[PDB]
């Protein structure tokens, strides 16, 4: 009996922003005027001009291998 399995396989995730070219990106002028506002609960606010954003909660990788020889 000769048990010689070969795993030579590849398991790859490429997730998010990759290999992109951004040549001279111009964000515009941004003006925010706020007067006499009331907030009675949680506020989360973002003000910008140019943003690049990547989260990637994903791209997770999972390999399970089992080898049994019974005689």
């Amino acid at each position: 009996i000769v048990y010689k399995p070969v795993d030579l396989s590849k398991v790859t995730s490429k997730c998010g922003s990759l290999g992109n070219i951004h040549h001279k990106p111009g964000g515009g002028q941004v003006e925010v005027k706020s007067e006499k506002l009331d907030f009675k609960d949680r506020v989360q606010s973002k003000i910008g001009s140019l943003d690049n954003i990547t989260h990637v909660p994903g791209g997770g990788n999972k390999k399970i291998e089992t080898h049994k020889l019974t005689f």
Copy 2:
């Protein structure tokens, strides 16, 4: 008995923004005027001009491989 399986396979995810060209993207002017506003519950706000956004909760990658030889 000779047991010589070969896995040479490739298992790949390419997820999100990739290999893109963004040549001279121009965001416009943004003006926000807020006056006399009332909010009684959670506020989440974004103000911008030019955005690139990739989330990728996906692109996850699962391999299961079982070998049994029973004599």
Copy 3:
């Protein structure tokens, strides 16, 4: 008995925005005027000019292999 399966497969997902060319995209001028508004529940708000957005919850990848030799 000779057991010699060969797996040489490719299992590939390409999901989202890829290989795109965006040449001189111009976002327009955006003006938002909000006066005397009342909100009694959750607000989620986005103001922009030019956006690129990719979510990709998908593109997930799953391979299962079982090899049995019983004698």
Copy 4:
């Protein structure tokens, strides 16, 4: 001008299991035998004899009133 609306209303939900009588309910004998099982997947398993279960995602209640007098 006299503005004297009277609201004496009831808005009621009764949802799930209520006002029931269960007299000497007898669960049977339960035997589960599991041998040589393989699971490649999420397993959610319940073994019991006698159950009473109420979920009630519903029964939600919503009342909106607006009173305007303009002169």
Copy 5:
């Protein structure tokens, strides 16, 4: 001008298990025998004999009033 609106209303949820009688409820004998089992992912298991269960994600209650007098 006499603005004397009256609210005397009731807004009620009764959700889940209530006012029930369970008289001598008998769970049976439960036997679980598990041999040589393999699990490759998340397992959630419950073994019992007699259960009473109430979830109630629901039964939520929401009242909104607006009163305007404008002159």
Copy 6:
């Protein structure tokens, strides 16, 4: 001008298990035998005989009043 609105209303949630009678509930005998088991991921297990369970994520209560007099 006489603005004398009266709220005398009630806004109530009764959620879960309440006003129930459980008279001599009998859990049965429970036997769990496990031999030669393999688990490769998170296990959550509950073994009991008699259970009473109430979660109640719900039953939430929300009242908004706005009173305006403008002259």
